[PDB]
């Protein structure tokens, strides 16, 4: 939460793209079989 956010080097410009491909995966209506065919039972 905090801990993680508090490298002052590792926590930096160094990124400034990955904050945004962690989410485009969520695609959501085309990944019914890859995001829950064969993952997701409940």
Do not use: C
Not at 2 to 30: I, M, P, T
Request: no cysteine.
């Amino acid at each position: 939460d905090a801990e993680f956010r508090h490298d002052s080097g590792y926590e930096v410009h160094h990124q400034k793209l990955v904050f945004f491909a962690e989410d485009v995966g969520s695609n959501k209506g085309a990944i019914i079989g890859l995001m829950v065919g064969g993952v997701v039972i409940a």
